[PDB]
Amino acid sequence: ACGYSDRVLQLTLGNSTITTQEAANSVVAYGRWPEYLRDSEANPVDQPTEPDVAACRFYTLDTVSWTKESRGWWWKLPDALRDMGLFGQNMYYHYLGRSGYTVHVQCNASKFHQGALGVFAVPEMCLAGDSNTTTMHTSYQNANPGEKGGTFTGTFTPDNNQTSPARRFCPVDYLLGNGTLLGNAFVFPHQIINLRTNNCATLVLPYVNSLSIDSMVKHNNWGIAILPLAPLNFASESSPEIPITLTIAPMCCEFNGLRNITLPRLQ
């Protein structure tokens, strides 16, 4: 009647707005919109900080590039937003924090391009390490890349330097980087950016954890995994490239246990 459509959306949070004209509806993970911590589930007793529009707004991370050789990308939350404006400051000044998110993945191309990205949001996205001599050895620094994220690989390559081990993840793409088959990742909240259909993915994520609130600096609640289910192609070019951009807004974030700021060892 007025022409409203699944494909055309506007999202506004704080001082930020996203528009899209080629959406494929949007997902609310497990049917649960983000929410503040109810009194009946509360646990730290101090009055929480709730930054509201100062932190619940769209932050855009560094753009990456999709090519025919890309195996996939991953980020962790809250880690990818640790250095984002007042969200990052509130996270590091407090022992505890909780937050939900709107995740908007952006990737446009043309009616002559093809390819499809699976965009998965995974609760507790534990990834496999690079070692066959020690388990659970990925270091804090390598497990937490911040906004640059990390990547998947098509080949497991064990680290053989036992003198100074690399201590990083070696996440194999068809094993979802965690020992399970990628074809089943669709039981996690997801969308697919299939270039002939849509140019974005939107996932609204509730805070998920076995606790009401926890250490954001120690623990990532959600992982975002983006993998090419169908490879990028274009006209008859051998090396096409198109960018992928992530923009994420915290939602209903609240924090407890205020003290001096955490200054983490990140390199």
For other proteins, the binding residues in 119-158 under the rule CB under 8 A are 123-129, 131-132, 135-141, 143, 156, 158
> Interaction with other proteins in 35-74: which residues (CB under 8 A)?
53, 56
Q: How far is residue 100's CA from residue 75's CA, in Å, rounded to a whole number?
A: 15
> Interaction with other proteins in 102-121: which residues (CB under 8 A)?
102
Q: Using the rule CB under 8 A, is 247 a contact of other proteins?
A: no
Of 111 and 238, CB closest to other proteins? 111
Evaluate whether 174 touches 181 at the Cβ level (below 8 Å): yes
Residues 5-34, mask of contacts with other proteins (x by CB under 8 A): xxxxxxxxxxxxx-x-x--xxxxxxxxx--
Q: Using the rule CB under 8 A, is 226 a contact of other proteins?
A: no
Q: How far is residue 120's CA from residue 223's CA, in Å, rounded to a whole number?
A: 8
Residue 143 φ then ψ, to 5°: -75, -25
Of 257, 250, 260, 233, nearest to 99 (Cα)?
A: 250
Give SS3 for 161: coil
- Tell whether the torsion through CA atoms of 107, 53, 84 and 38 is positive or negative: negative
Minimum CB separation of residue 213 from other proteins in Å reads: 11
- In the set 163, 236, 239, 263, which binds other proteins (CB under 8 A)? 263
Q: Using the rule CB under 8 A, is 161 a contact of other proteins?
A: no
Of 166, 89, 172, nearest to 134 (Cα)?
A: 166
Minimum CB separation of residue 54 from other proteins in Å reads: 11
- In the set 99, 106, 198, 247, which binds other proteins (CB under 8 A)? 198
